[PDB]
Design a protein around this ligand. Sequence first.
Ligand SMILES: *[C@@H]1O[C@H](CO)[C@@H](O[C@@H]2O[C@H](CO)[C@@H](O[C@@H]3O[C@H](CO[C@H]4O[C@H](CO)[C@@H](O)[C@H](O)[C@@H]4O)[C@@H](O)[C@H](O[C@H]4O[C@H](CO)[C@@H](O)[C@H](O)[C@@H]4O)[C@@H]3O)[C@H](O)[C@H]2NC(C)=O)[C@H](O)[C@H]1NC(C)=O
Ligand SMILES: *[C@@H]1O[C@H](CO)[C@@H](O[C@@H]2O[C@H](CO)[C@@H](O[C@@H]3O[C@H](CO[C@H]4O[C@H](CO)[C@@H](O)[C@H](O)[C@@H]4O)[C@@H](O)[C@H](O[C@H]4O[C@H](CO)[C@@H](O)[C@H](O)[C@@H]4O)[C@@H]3O)[C@H](O)[C@H]2NC(C)=O)[C@H](O)[C@H]1NC(C)=O
Ligand SMILES: *[C@@H]1O[C@H](CO)[C@@H](O[C@@H]2O[C@H](CO)[C@@H](O[C@@H]3O[C@H](CO[C@H]4O[C@H](CO)[C@@H](O)[C@H](O)[C@@H]4O)[C@@H](O)[C@H](O[C@H]4O[C@H](CO)[C@@H](O)[C@H](O)[C@@H]4O)[C@@H]3O)[C@H](O)[C@H]2NC(C)=O)[C@H](O)[C@H]1NC(C)=O
Ligand SMILES: *[C@@H]1O[C@H](CO)[C@@H](O[C@@H]2O[C@H](CO)[C@@H](O[C@@H]3O[C@H](CO[C@H]4O[C@H](CO)[C@@H](O)[C@H](O)[C@@H]4O)[C@@H](O)[C@H](O[C@H]4O[C@H](CO)[C@@H](O)[C@H](O)[C@@H]4O)[C@@H]3O)[C@H](O)[C@H]2NC(C)=O)[C@H](O)[C@H]1NC(C)=O
Ligand SMILES: *[C@@H]1O[C@H](CO)[C@@H](O[C@@H]2O[C@H](CO)[C@@H](O[C@@H]3O[C@H](CO[C@H]4O[C@H](CO)[C@@H](O)[C@H](O)[C@@H]4O)[C@@H](O)[C@H](O[C@H]4O[C@H](CO)[C@@H](O)[C@H](O)[C@@H]4O)[C@@H]3O)[C@H](O)[C@H]2NC(C)=O)[C@H](O)[C@H]1NC(C)=O
Ligand SMILES: *[C@@H]1O[C@H](CO)[C@@H](O)[C@H](O)[C@H]1NC(C)=O
Ligand SMILES: *[C@@H]1O[C@H](CO)[C@@H](O)[C@H](O)[C@H]1NC(C)=O
Ligand SMILES: *[C@@H]1O[C@H](CO)[C@@H](O)[C@H](O)[C@H]1NC(C)=O
Ligand SMILES: *[C@@H]1O[C@H](CO)[C@@H](O)[C@H](O)[C@H]1NC(C)=O
Ligand SMILES: *[C@@H]1O[C@H](CO)[C@@H](O)[C@H](O)[C@H]1NC(C)=O
Lengths: 334, 334, 334, 334, 334
Amino acid sequence: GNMSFVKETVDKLLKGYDIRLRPDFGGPPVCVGMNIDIASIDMVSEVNMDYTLTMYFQQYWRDKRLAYSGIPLNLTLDNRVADQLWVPDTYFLNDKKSFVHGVTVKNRMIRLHPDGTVLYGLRITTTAACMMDLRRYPLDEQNCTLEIESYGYTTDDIEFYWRGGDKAVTGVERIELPQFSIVEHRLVSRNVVFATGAYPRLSLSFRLKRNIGYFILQTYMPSILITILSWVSFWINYDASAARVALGITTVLTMTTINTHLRETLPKIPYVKAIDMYLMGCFVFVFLALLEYAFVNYIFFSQPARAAAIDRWSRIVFPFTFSLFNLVYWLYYV
Amino acid sequence: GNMSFVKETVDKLLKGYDIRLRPDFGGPPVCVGMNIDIASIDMVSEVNMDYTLTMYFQQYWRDKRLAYSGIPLNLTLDNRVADQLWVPDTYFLNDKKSFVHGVTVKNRMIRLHPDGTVLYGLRITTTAACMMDLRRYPLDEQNCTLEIESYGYTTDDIEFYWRGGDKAVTGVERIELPQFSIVEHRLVSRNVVFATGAYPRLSLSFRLKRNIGYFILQTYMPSILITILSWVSFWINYDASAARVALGITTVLTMTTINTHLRETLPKIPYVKAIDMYLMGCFVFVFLALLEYAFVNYIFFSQPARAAAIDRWSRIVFPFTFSLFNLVYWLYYV
Amino acid sequence: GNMSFVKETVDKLLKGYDIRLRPDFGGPPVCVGMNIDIASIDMVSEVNMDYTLTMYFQQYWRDKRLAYSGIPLNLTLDNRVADQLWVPDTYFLNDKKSFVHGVTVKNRMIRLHPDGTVLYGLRITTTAACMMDLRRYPLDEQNCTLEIESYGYTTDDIEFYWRGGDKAVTGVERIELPQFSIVEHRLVSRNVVFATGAYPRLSLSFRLKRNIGYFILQTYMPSILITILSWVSFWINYDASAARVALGITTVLTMTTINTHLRETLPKIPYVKAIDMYLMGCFVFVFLALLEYAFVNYIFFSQPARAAAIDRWSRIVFPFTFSLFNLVYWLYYV
Amino acid sequence: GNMSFVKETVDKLLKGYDIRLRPDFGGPPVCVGMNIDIASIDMVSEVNMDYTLTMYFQQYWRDKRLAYSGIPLNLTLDNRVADQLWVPDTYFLNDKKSFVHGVTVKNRMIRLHPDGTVLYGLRITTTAACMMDLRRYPLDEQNCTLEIESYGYTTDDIEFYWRGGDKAVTGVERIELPQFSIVEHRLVSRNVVFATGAYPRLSLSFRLKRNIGYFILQTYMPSILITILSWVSFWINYDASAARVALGITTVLTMTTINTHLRETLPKIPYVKAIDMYLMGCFVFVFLALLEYAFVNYIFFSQPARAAAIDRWSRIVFPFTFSLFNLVYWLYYV
Amino acid sequence: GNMSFVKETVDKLLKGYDIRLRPDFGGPPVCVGMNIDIASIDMVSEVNMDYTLTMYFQQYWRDKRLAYSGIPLNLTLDNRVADQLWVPDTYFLNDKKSFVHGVTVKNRMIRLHPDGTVLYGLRITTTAACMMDLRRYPLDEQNCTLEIESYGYTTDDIEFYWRGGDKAVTGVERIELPQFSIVEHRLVSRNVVFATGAYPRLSLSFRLKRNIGYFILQTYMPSILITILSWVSFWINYDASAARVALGITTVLTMTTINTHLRETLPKIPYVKAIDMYLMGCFVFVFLALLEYAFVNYIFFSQPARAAAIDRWSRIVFPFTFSLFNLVYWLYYV
Ligand SMILES: *[C@@H]1O[C@H](CO)[C@@H](O[C@@H]2O[C@H](CO)[C@@H](O[C@@H]3O[C@H](CO[C@H]4O[C@H](CO)[C@@H](O)[C@H](O)[C@@H]4O)[C@@H](O)[C@H](O[C@H]4O[C@H](CO)[C@@H](O)[C@H](O)[C@@H]4O)[C@@H]3O)[C@H](O)[C@H]2NC(C)=O)[C@H](O)[C@H]1NC(C)=O
Ligand SMILES: *[C@@H]1O[C@H](CO)[C@@H](O[C@@H]2O[C@H](CO)[C@@H](O[C@@H]3O[C@H](CO[C@H]4O[C@H](CO)[C@@H](O)[C@H](O)[C@@H]4O)[C@@H](O)[C@H](O[C@H]4O[C@H](CO)[C@@H](O)[C@H](O)[C@@H]4O)[C@@H]3O)[C@H](O)[C@H]2NC(C)=O)[C@H](O)[C@H]1NC(C)=O
Ligand SMILES: *[C@@H]1O[C@H](CO)[C@@H](O[C@@H]2O[C@H](CO)[C@@H](O[C@@H]3O[C@H](CO[C@H]4O[C@H](CO)[C@@H](O)[C@H](O)[C@@H]4O)[C@@H](O)[C@H](O[C@H]4O[C@H](CO)[C@@H](O)[C@H](O)[C@@H]4O)[C@@H]3O)[C@H](O)[C@H]2NC(C)=O)[C@H](O)[C@H]1NC(C)=O
Ligand SMILES: *[C@@H]1O[C@H](CO)[C@@H](O[C@@H]2O[C@H](CO)[C@@H](O[C@@H]3O[C@H](CO[C@H]4O[C@H](CO)[C@@H](O)[C@H](O)[C@@H]4O)[C@@H](O)[C@H](O[C@H]4O[C@H](CO)[C@@H](O)[C@H](O)[C@@H]4O)[C@@H]3O)[C@H](O)[C@H]2NC(C)=O)[C@H](O)[C@H]1NC(C)=O
Ligand SMILES: *[C@@H]1O[C@H](CO)[C@@H](O[C@@H]2O[C@H](CO)[C@@H](O[C@@H]3O[C@H](CO[C@H]4O[C@H](CO)[C@@H](O)[C@H](O)[C@@H]4O)[C@@H](O)[C@H](O[C@H]4O[C@H](CO)[C@@H](O)[C@H](O)[C@@H]4O)[C@@H]3O)[C@H](O)[C@H]2NC(C)=O)[C@H](O)[C@H]1NC(C)=O
Ligand SMILES: *[C@@H]1O[C@H](CO)[C@@H](O)[C@H](O)[C@H]1NC(C)=O
Ligand SMILES: *[C@@H]1O[C@H](CO)[C@@H](O)[C@H](O)[C@H]1NC(C)=O
Ligand SMILES: *[C@@H]1O[C@H](CO)[C@@H](O)[C@H](O)[C@H]1NC(C)=O
Ligand SMILES: *[C@@H]1O[C@H](CO)[C@@H](O)[C@H](O)[C@H]1NC(C)=O
Ligand SMILES: *[C@@H]1O[C@H](CO)[C@@H](O)[C@H](O)[C@H]1NC(C)=O
């Protein structure tokens, strides 16, 4: 309760305190416990292969140089005192753009304990790279990880562990991804050996399952219906050259128009995906449907009996082949 | 009026003043009163699920260490003196990108009072996350909130309240949102219990009702008219194969062209919305209209009497079914 | 000419100088004169409702504490000395993103005078919010203002005025806006009363008239010509079912294609504009033109004499109605 | 070779050195020589009317206060010593976003000479505004300039000149612009009189000639071919109503589709360009081609002899008028 | 193990240490060894002609002033001590936007050795300019280089070499480029002579081979199929004017629609590419196919025998010419 007495204690601790030396320098490595309180996942971008994450990053360790006695209450110092202490050189291995919020003040917390324990919390919005195998898009399951490592110190100087076991990372249930749904998150602690030596490593991975309801209604359904309309020409009198030619080519034109516009809406990733195969697969059927009439029209004059046979056979072969195409497609990717 | 006397008083207050210790450290929590003067809401983005807000954020508390006597006038110190005082660690829970304007100087105000009262104002442009339930888009009502909390101190160390009751937040009437209209704003004061303890919480929520006039004229009206034109083929002589086939497929082509282009203009949110159901609902009718002629054309030769019956029945069934589709659609989402 | 003597004078002025106290603290308010030398207006964005402005912002006031004698020449100190003086807390009320250029050095000027007069110039590129009433777009006239106010001090502590009267703001004639043309700029000085008290206010407003030549050629002209082509079907033999049906629906398809693509090129503002009414107005005529043939075709067999009467009457009613539509449109918005 | 002796010399020079006073304060103006080593021109944006430039900006002047004796070798001090010296307040008049690279260290060089000469180099990536007269786009020649001026000091206090004459600016030959080709660069030294007095001015201008090969193949060629296909209807039997009507309107539809999509690819500049006139010029011919058939079809029944005369005359008038249109277009803009 | 003894040693080394003087000032140049541990290549943008690179940049040199004795263990000081030492002025010649990550702390490592050796590591995300010769796009092979040079010091003052020979740069095998595949990387050490003198240079170049699977399926395949459908009109009865005219023009319309939409998806680079020639090459065949029918239709009445000869000859000439076009195209660019 005595502010002057507390002020003297803090100045005494900081007097002779060297920030360039880790706790227990030259001795056993300092154990650091880390908890993450995830606030939200802002976006998951397939074009940039990254996801934006906002979280409360806390580090828990003990520094004997900061131990104080006589004050039972835990000291909650101002965030500006963190520049005068020693903090682990924790950094994220796969981040691309990370920053600490500073409104109204820097979102930073320093809390001291009588036994020298230090609690250090940060609110960080980081963009972590996540390579995606989008061959089975949009029926794919992604695994995006956040890697935590010490930049300068080795395992002999510092050790990382998840404070709380599997309960170290919270707030996953509150994440609301419009496109994905979180299935499972895992916590991994391991040591990685590099050229300069072993380093502590902490990993936070998510397995994301993409929602398919939007793509079925917006992408797959229009393509199927246009393919169905291409079969209308089969149930048309062969003498109506204008009707079947116009119907066949317009369906090809309609298929191209939807296919080109979807690509612009879809991510700009330049490699073959599951949706691209299906759309080009349907484009073959409308291409074959128009070619079917050309063969019928050419031989209609010479062999009218055979021409009608091809027209009625196409009424079964095309729906049967298309169903087999869907059966192969919807089992290979599911 | 004596500048030298005032200068001595300020230096005396700052002498022995510790920024690392909150007012009444070790005693009752310091009560902080907060008022918000909203300037404008820059944008409300559905793609990023966030809204940009510009406001004058003011904090009101009392620090006995800064109390001075002999000068009746309230001291309006320079903004650069705020770095030498103690200010609450107020931060916004759901913000994404927030900053304080600094042109020409930092938009910051420090005002002192004889009884130790401190007034601290900031002009902050913050981007706050707002998860949106856009299933009923564009006929949806959104509720975006701004959450205020203390990062480090608990309820035992600091307490938050709205200075002025329901009058704490002003400027809502002056907000001009081109797309939304503000219906109601609420002020909520509560304490939230976390792992580290209870924290003060202040909430500022808005309920936004989206305007529909643009979407009715630009999106719903063109789709209805194209659907109406699909019924023109019913009032066409059945022998005109070229006329009805061309009309039917072009309406399907026209429906696809407008549908694909609207999606690019509409937000890239990948899930089913109210507008998507309506556009795909209308796309079924034009799909059925073309299929209706195919059935009529196939049986026209064998049963001309029955074929004409189907053509005239479609003149009533299709308009009646479409009206029922609108009746269900315009009551479910309204 | 004596550098050592000048160096001693500046140090003497800064000795005992308090930046936390305004000139004549506790006395009459300090009058500040402001001139603006506008360099260019970078952009005027309708989507974001803001305009980017680059200008030379200068402030002119007198501080007796900085008065010096013995040196007739005006002192032009380095820009880094501004951090050691007192400058007004001038800020822009409606700015969104503002910064001071710092290449190669900070674009800042401090000039001292023997009578204590201080000249303070800044080169600022600010993005100021400008709400636009785009109902009459693109035939609208916009009024974008830049508001200048003191953040902390009231009218009792500081007063604002335009140094030079109507000549305070220059460089308006040199502004080259590709889309707009500046018609008139006004300077307004007023005092605004808030909860904390009255504040000085300086306003710089522009009235922008949008150019219409681009929209007439690129948007209005194609729509008119397509509407004219819809009347071609009237001068077509009624027995040619394929010709008139194809012409009617393709014009509807052509009207939709241009209408959808223009919206993407046009700003994403979601409310009804003047151009939207005209494009949807023309879309009705092509919709009615196709409906006109359907009525003629249906009754052509039963009453060929009446069907020809409707076809020839449409050759006059449609051009006359369209001209009246333009006459109403081009007088309501002009 | 004696590091201690060199360290003493530098400290002696900085002792008593005032950064707020220019060299020869109160005397003749200090002459500054400037050389530019252009690295690359990143982009030339027509939408934003600016170009991004990366260069090595060096300033050359003499300060007698920094003169040292006894050390023949030129001193190459660390970049962090520039904050302790006096440097000209050089800034770019027409820049929009400029910065100095700071990886790994700040790209800044300070070099001292025994005679007091100071060399000051910076690596700056600046975005300079360049108003473009794009009426003749894409057959236009642009002139983008970089303006150099002193922010605070007048001609009486500082003078600018190009160190090396016409050889001051190098690296122009190494610039690789994908769209433009540099024709000529000029160096201009002049004094500009403002309200506060005369200022030194250095100008670096480029004259850029736009490449036309891409636009000829991608924009002009498709438009010409579609216009040619519109003349196919002339060599079609007049009795084929379906063939000529479909061909005429589809060419109009094809012309609209390419015209609308090009505008989105082309810059969003809202004023008439050379390409816009040509595309709308070709759109008239296809509009007239369809109108030509309407006149022929209407009078074909009454006067078949005259109708055939118009059809064969259109086979010559349209190609001749189109060639004259190109002859006027390709000479007015070339 | 004695923290106080280590603290005294570091302070002794920093006492009298001058950062403005390079090691062995006035003597032999200081040799700097550099290793790069590439983390990932974020993107390779053809529009901006740059690639984003994330790497661990380490510098290895010896400074005798920092040599210490008595402590066998290598000192791993805090990253904040780097501001108090001397580090090479290493910068990247062709970078555009480069920064050092600073979350949670600045990603910087300083390690000292008893023999005065200093290890200095940085984690840098740099955007390096890479001019691309995209004439053969998308069948092109690109060569993007990262250039390393000393900004201020010449070869007489500093020398650069790759520490580890060809093993200096690692992590290339772990790079996952979705569009490109890394073929070979080279390390080059050379001295470049400029106006101010020779400078050390280190180069890291990559040769990237673009994947073609996406472009074959998405771009080349649709164009070929539409060209094939243009040959359908050859196997159509010549009397069917409506069928062949509609098929010919719609294929031209279909070719234009896909061609225009691909350009928007493709990079905005304004010069002729390999893909542009192929798409315009195919557009000629559909243009010639429609022209072929016009010649046949015109002379069908006068010379029916000759008209049928042209129709059957087109069934061979067009497929043969198209195959030769592909044979020339697929050998010139491969
Ligand atoms: C996304 O993809 C990443 C990989 O790219 C997955 O990460 C892997 O996760 C698994 C767990 O699901 C990890 O496997 C575990 O590794 C632990 C650490 O191993 C280190 O230490 C041991 C010695 O103790 C060494 O042998 C080893 O080489 C490492 O140095 C182990 O301790 C775990 O063992 C436990 O489980 C196994 C069964 O799995 C038991 O047999 C053991 O007895 C013990 O109980 C386990 O092996 C794996 O290391 C991770 N890989 C990487 C690269 O981090 C993510 O899981 C994935 N995302 C999701 C959501 O699954
Ligand atoms: C957007 O959506 C958010 C929710 O996501 C809405 O926020 C809620 O707003 C309501 C008010 O409209 C809040 O309800 C009020 O909470 C107050 C605080 O409760 C705390 O303290 C009490 C004890 O005093 C505890 O029991 C409780 O658990 C909390 O810890 C209460 O004091 C209020 O009670 C008053 O009103 C009720 C009637 O509503 C009376 O019965 C009471 O006697 C008393 O007068 C009230 O319950 C709610 O807490 C808010 N939720 C959140 C999560 O903040 C926004 O309102 C919405 N936007 C709009 C525009 O509506
Ligand atoms: C864009 O839109 C803005 C408004 O949103 C316009 O700004 C207005 O501009 C007009 C002038 O064109 C301003 O009117 C003038 O206000 C001055 C200040 O008034 C204050 O002080 C008086 C007492 O002196 C109080 O009564 C008053 O309430 C204010 O506190 C007056 O001094 C002016 O009076 C002079 O002109 C009038 C005639 O206009 C004479 O009758 C008087 O005798 C005297 O000569 C005048 O009234 C108005 O205040 C501005 N509004 C705002 C909100 O700033 C922009 O002009 C417009 N853009 C363009 C290009 O026009
Ligand atoms: C892009 O567009 C800009 C203009 O917007 C062009 O810049 C102009 O460039 C020309 C040179 O090509 C400049 O003309 C030269 O100006 C020099 C400076 O003039 C100042 O000083 C004189 C007195 O010495 C004053 O009278 C004058 O008012 C100025 O204050 C002159 O010294 C030059 O004279 C020399 O050449 C002329 C012939 O051109 C001879 O007759 C003379 O004897 C002498 O040898 C000359 O007049 C012009 O000033 C520039 N304008 C601006 C605004 O900077 C760029 O050139 C253009 N880009 C390209 C690539 O051309
Ligand atoms: C992307 O494109 C760049 C060029 O734009 C390529 O970079 C070139 O790479 C080659 C190697 O593949 C470099 O050639 C080598 O240069 C070394 C340095 O030369 C300097 O020093 C010598 C004297 O020692 C001077 O004569 C010379 O002028 C330079 O000042 C040489 O030491 C190398 O010689 C070795 O190899 C050759 C055979 O190649 C042997 O004959 C020699 O005996 C010796 O073993 C060699 O000549 C070239 O300098 C680079 N150019 C630039 C501008 O950097 C990239 O390689 C390319 N990307 C890929 C993936 O290939
Ligand atoms: C606080 O401690 C100081 C120093 O021992 C002492 O003088 C003062 O009386 C104490 N105050 C209280 C309230 O204990
Ligand atoms: C201001 O206070 C000082 C110190 O007491 C005194 O010397 C001076 O005369 C005072 N001036 C006025 C105007 O009261
Ligand atoms: C400048 O002033 C100093 C201090 O009075 C004096 O010693 C010196 O001689 C003066 N120099 C000149 C040139 O007047
Ligand atoms: C460097 O100069 C100092 C000071 O004069 C002297 O003591 C020392 O011996 C000199 N060293 C050399 C190598 O000249
Ligand atoms: C560390 O060194 C100091 C200074 O010599 C000495 O007083 C102290 O006893 C030493 N401690 C240990 C553990 O060696």
